[PDB]
Design an enzyme around this catalytic site. Structure first.
Site, short mmCIF file in Angstrom:
data_model
loop_
_atom_site.label_atom_id
_atom_site.label_comp_id
_atom_site.label_asym_id
_atom_site.label_seq_id
_atom_site.Cartn_x
_atom_site.Cartn_y
_atom_site.Cartn_z
CG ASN D 126 -1.73 -0.67 0.90
OD1 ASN D 126 -2.75 -0.98 -0.34
ND2 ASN D 126 -2.55 -1.28 2.06
CG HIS D 181 -7.23 -0.39 -1.44
ND1 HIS D 181 -8.23 -1.15 -0.83
CD2 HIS D 181 -6.08 -1.80 -1.34
CE1 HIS D 181 -7.71 -1.85 0.61
NE2 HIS D 181 -6.08 -2.05 0.13
CL LIG Z 1 -4.92 -3.97 2.42
#
Ligand SMILES: [Cl-]
Ligand SMILES: Cn1ccnc1C(=O)c1ccc(NC(=O)C[C@@H](C(=O)O)c2ccc(C(F)(F)F)cc2)cc1
Ligand SMILES: [Cl-]
Ligand SMILES: [Cl-]
Ligand SMILES: [Cl-]
Lengths: 316, 331, 330, 315
Positions: D126, D181
Site C-alpha cells: 500500500n 483502494h
Molecule cells: Cl489492505
C-alpha cells in the site's frame, strides 16, 4: 458482413492485447470412448489443464462430446476445450493421453496416430493407455523416437489401486493406508509383490509368512486373482471399464503436470534389471514434468522375480 | 487360529450411520455423470446407487469402487432394494425414459410419471428427511409429481430445472464476449425445455446491463441476433443427442453444482424447479425454474425476478404449456 | 416493504442444527493456522472460534469473514462465551501457553492443565457428542487430561501427537532420496517431543525396506548418518521458533489432515496420541502416539507395530517419561 | 553420503513451468503464500525478503507441511536468483506510506524484473494504486503485466455485507467498488443486483442520503474494514491472502474472469494523466488483457475523477 456493425462487445470491453499466448499447461486425449472421456472428465475436475484437446476419427461423436464438456464450463476451471480430427488442435500439448484403438490391429493405428502427435507436440510426454499398454508403450517409443523417459504407459497403476482397495476391504483400512504393488504385465501375468505389502510399515508377510501361497489359510492369493479378473468382471457387467482407469490416468497426469515426483507402477523399458535382456513392463517409477525420471530397484523374491521373468517372457 | 487383521489391528469400536450420504437413482449416462461429479467434489461420505438394471448397476458400482484410492468417499454401495438408500441427506433421481433423437422431453411424461409412482414412495420410506433433487425429464412436471407422491414440503423437493440452461446461456455469452462464463451473468427461467425464457433485462458483465448498452438485445431487430444465443440453449440437448446419442457431462456437473450448495448449506442462488403459484399472475399448481436460495433445507427462499411485459408473458406461456400436461395425468 | 422483502420470498423460518460444525479453541498462530487450513479444505459448514482475548478474537473472525467470497464455509462465528460452540462435531483445542525458545514442551504441563480444567468442561457442555482433537502442548499428556475431565470414551479424545513429527520425517526423506514425501513412508512414534522414536524398521519406498538395503540405517555406525534426520525432526520446532518465534503453518496442515479423516470417516492411519495401555507390556494409562485408524467416531482401532528390541526400548522410555509426569497430576 | 539412494533408485536423467514468487514474508505475504499453496496454483513457490531469519523460518514451516501439499518445491533466500523463471511475482514488502514504500520499490522492482522478465507483477503493498504505477515505471513492462490488488478485496467485502443483509451467499451477491483502494473508493450502486435484479431499481434511494435503510453504511464499513481489523488483531492477512490467491488463479490458469484490480485508466471517465486505480479487468496468462467500460452515473463518475486527481497528485 459487408457493413460495419457496432458490437455489444465493443461498447462493453476495451482491448489491450491480441495474443493467444500459446497454451502453458495443455493436455490432449486421443480417443473419445468410455476410457477417453473418463480421463477427460477426471482431468477437468482436477484442474490439471488450462486447455483440453480431444481427437478421434468418429467426428459426429467427437463433436458431441466436446459440446457436452463445453456446456459445463461454468462448473470447471479449464477455460478452453477443443476437438477435431486434424491433430493440429493438439499443438503445444505438455501431455498426450492415447486411449484410441479397438495386437497388430491396434499397432497399425499407432502408426497413423503417433507421428501426428509427435508432429504438433514434440516436447510432450506420451501417456499410453491403449491395450496392451505394455507393448503399445514400446511401439509408440519406436514410432515416435521420443526418449524413453517421455514415453509412459499406464501399466499397472490401476492393478495396484485395485489391489490396495481389496486390501482395505479385508483390513478395514482406507486404501490410502494399504500399501501394495502389482508389477509386470498389465494382464493375467501381473506380479503381486507380497514382500512389500504393509500397513504403517508393518510387513504383512512377516506377520503371516504363508501370505500369497496356497497353504495360506486366509487365501490372500485370491486378492491378486481378483485384480486380474477385475476388468473381466466389470466388462461382463456393464460392457467396459472407464471410471477406475480414468481416475488412475488423472492421478498420473497430476504427478506429470505438477512435477510431484510420486512413485507409480507404470510401463517402461526394463532392459537389464532382473536378468531380462530384451521389453516394456511396469515397475515403480518417479514421475515428473520430464516423465519417468527414475526407477526403483525393488528387491524381489526368487519366486516373485521368477514370475516377472515369466511376465517379460510372455510379452514377446 | 489368529487372523492377520487381528495380529495387525487392535479394535476399539465394533460399530459402523453416515453423516453426508447421497443416493443416485438410475445408473444411466446421466446418473453415472452425477455420481462421478459428486465423488470428485467430495460432497458425501457414502454414495448409494439404485436401479432396476442389476448387471449394469453392479458393474458401475465396482468400477467406481476400484478408483477408491483416488477418491475421498470411503463407502460406495448399490442395490435394487431401496433400503440401501436409508438416511440419505440428498436423493438424486435420474432413472426413467430419456428422450431419443428429436424427441421432446414432454413426450416422456406418461412413462416416467408411472416410474415415479414406484420410486418416490420407496425413497421417502427410508429417507423421510432427505432433499429430493429430481433430474428425470420432464423435470418441471416430475418435480410436481414427486412433491405430490412424497408428501414432502416443497422446500425439500427440488428439480434441476434450468440450472443447466442458464449455464449454457452463460457459456455462449462468454464465447461472444471473450469472458469466462463465471463473469457472464444471464438467467434462463421457466421450463427446462423448448419454452424456456431468457431474461435479457438482467444480463450484465460486472454489473453493466447489456440491454442498456444494446436496447435491441433479444429482439427481432437485433443486428447481432442475440436471440440465437437462446435458440442454441433450447436446441443444445437435441444437437448433442443427435451427435453422441445422449447428454451426460453437462447435466452431471450442473447436478453436482446444486448438490454442493445443498450439502454445504451455501445459500447460493440457482434456477431450480419449484412451485410458482401466485407469482406473475400464475394461478395453477405448476412447477418451473425461478432463482432460488439453496441450502441444507433445500429451497428456503425464492428470488422475485423483475420481468418486462414480453419476459413475464413468455413465462406465463411456459407455465400454461406445463399445466396443460399436469392436468391430463393421474398421479 | 424493505428491499429484502421486495426481492426475496421466504419459505422456511425454521433453522436446523449445524451438520458439519468444527470449533477451534484458541486464536493464536496455531489455532488460526488450523482455521485457515480447515476453511480451504471445505471440511465444515460452520466454524466457531473461541478464546479469552475479546479483541483479537473479533479481529480474526472478521478477517476470515471478509474472505467469504473465496470460501465454501458459509458461517464463521466466534465469542468468549462457549455457547457459540454448540453442536460441534469436532472441537480443536489449541489454547494454552506455547513453547518459548529453548523451553521444552513438558514445562507447559502445569500451566495448560489449569487452562484445560476451564476449557474442557465448557466444550463438553455444549458439544457432548463431539470428538476432542487436542493440539496444545505437551499434547500427549494433555490428551490424557482432556479424557479424564471430559468423561468421553478414549476413542473420542485424540491428540495431534506425532502426525507432524512423521510428516517432517517424510519430508526429509524425500529431500535425501529425491522423492515426494507422499511416496516416502516412515513413522515417528512415542512422545510429540524429544523422546520421539523413529521406526527405522518400517522405513521404505515402494515397499522396499531401507534398513534391509542399509543394515546400518539409523545406528551410530551409519555411513549416511540417518539418525540426524530424526534429530532434525526433534529439533525442528526449536529451530523454527528461533527464526520466526513460533510454529503455525505445519501444525495447521497436520491438524487439518486429521480433521479430514475424522469429518469424512476416511479410516486412514495416523500417528496420534491415545492410550497405549496393553502395547509392549505397558500397564499404565499413558497417552502417546501410535498409528491409529481415524474415522467419524475418532480412533476406532490401533495398529500393533512390530518394533525391534531397540526401537521398543526407546518407546518404553518415552512412555516412562510421560507417565512420570502424568501420575503427579490432580 | 548418499549410497543408499543409488541402491534403491536407478537414475535416468529442467526449469519451473508454473513458478510463483511472494516478495515479503510478513502477515500478508505468508497469507498469500499459504492460500496459493492450498489452491495448487504453483509447482514452485519462492519466498524473498531481507530479514534472513524470518525468511528461513517461514520457508521451513511451510516445508514441513509438504506432505499435505502439492507444491513440490518451496525455496527462499535474500538473493533474487531464487525468483528466476517466475510466471507471477506478488509484491507485498513494505511498511501515508508513500515515501517509505516508494523507496523500497526502487530497490526491489529492478531485481525482480531481472530474473523474471516474462512474468506478471501483482502489487499488493500500500498504497497499491500508486505503487502499481511505481512498479510499472521502474519495471518497464507493458501496463498489461503490472497489476495492483486494488479493490478486489474491497468488492469481496462489499459482497458479504450484502450477503448478511439479504441472507444470500456473497457468491450470489454482486456489487462493485471501484477507484482508489482507500477512503475514496466508489461504490457503483447502479450495478448492485441479485440474480440480475438491480437493487437500485427496486429501491431508488439505494446508497443515497435519502436511503431509509441506509445502504451507504455498507460502503462505509468497507472503507473502515481495514482500520477496524487492525484495531482488534493488529493487522489484516487472511482476507487479503484469499483475495490475492483468487487473482493468482485467473492469471495462472488464464481463466479470463473479471476482477476490480488497479490499472492505468488513461482515457476513461475523463483522465489524461498516468494514474492507476481499480476497474473491472479481464485477467489471464498475459495479465490484464481487457477493461470493462462500466457506465457510471454523474455522481459516480464525479467521485472517480476526484479519487483520480488526488491519487495522480502524489504520482
Ligand atoms: Cl489492505
Ligand atoms: C424404475 N426404478 C429405478 C430404480 N428403482 C426402480 C423401481 O421401479 C423400483 C420399485 C420398487 C422397488 N422395491 C424395492 O427395492 C423393495 C426392497 C426395499 O424397499 O428395500 C425390498 C427388499 C427386501 C425385501 C424383503 F425383505 F422382503 F426381502 C422387500 C423389499 C425397487 C425398485
Ligand atoms: Cl446459473
Ligand atoms: Cl504421517
Ligand atoms: Cl452467479
Amino acid at each position: 458482413n459487408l457493413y460495419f456493425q457496432a458490437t455489444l462487445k465493443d461498447q462493453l470491453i476495451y482491448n489491450l492485447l491480441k495474443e493467444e499466448q500459446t497454451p502453458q499447461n495443455k493436455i490432449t486425449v486421443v480417443g473419445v470412448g468410455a476410457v477417453g472421456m473418463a480421463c477427460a472428465i477426471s482431468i477437468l475436475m482436477k484442474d490439471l489443464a488450462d486447455e483440453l484437446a480431444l481427437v478421434d476419427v468418429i467426428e459426429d461423436k467427437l463433436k458431441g462430446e466436446m459440446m457436452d464438456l463445453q456446456h459445463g464450463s461454468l462448473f470447471l476451471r479449464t477455460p478452453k476445450i477443443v476437438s477435431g480430427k486434424d491433430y493440429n488442435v493438439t499443438a503445444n500439448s505438455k501431455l498426450v493421453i492415447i486411449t484410441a484403438g479397438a495386437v497388430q490391429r491396434n499397432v497399425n493405428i499407432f502408426k497413423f496416430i503417433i507421428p501426428n502427435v509427435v508432429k504438433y507436440s514434440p516436447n510432450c510426454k506420451l501417456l499410453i493407455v491403449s491395450n496392451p499398454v505394455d507393448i503399445l508403450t514400446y511401439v509408440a517409443w519406436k514410432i515416435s523416437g521420443f526418449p524413453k523417459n517421455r514415453v509412459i504407459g499406464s501399466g499397472c497403476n490401476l492393478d495396484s489401486a485395485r489391489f490396495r482397495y481389496l486390501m482395505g476391504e479385508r483390513l478395514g483400512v482406507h486404501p490410502l493406508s494399504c500399501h501394495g504393488w502389482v508389477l509386470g504385465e498389465h494382464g493375467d501375468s501381473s506380479v503381486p509383490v507380497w514382500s512389500g505389502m504393509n500397513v504403517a510399515g508393518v510387513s504383512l508377510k512377516t506377520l503371516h509368512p504363508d501370505l500369497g501361497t496356497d497353504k495360506d489359510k486366509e487365501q490372500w492369493k485370491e486378492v491378486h486373482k481378483q485384480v486380474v479378473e477385475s476388468a473381466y468382471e466389470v466388462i461382463k457387467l456393464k460392457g467396459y471399464t472407464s471410471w477406475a482407469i480414468g481416475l488412475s490416468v488423472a492421478d498420473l497426469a497430476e504427478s506429470i503436470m505438477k512435477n510431484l515426483r510420486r512413485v507409480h507402477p507404470v510401463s517402461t523399458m526394463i532392459k537389464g534389471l532382473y536378468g531380462i535382456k530384451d521389453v516394456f513392463l511396469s515397475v515403480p517409477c518417479i514421475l515428473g514434468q520430464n516423465g519417468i525420471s527414475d526407477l526403483v530397484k525393488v528387491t524381489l523374491t526368487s519366486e516373485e522375480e521368477a514370475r516377472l521373468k515369466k511376465s517379460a517372457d510372455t510379452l514377446w
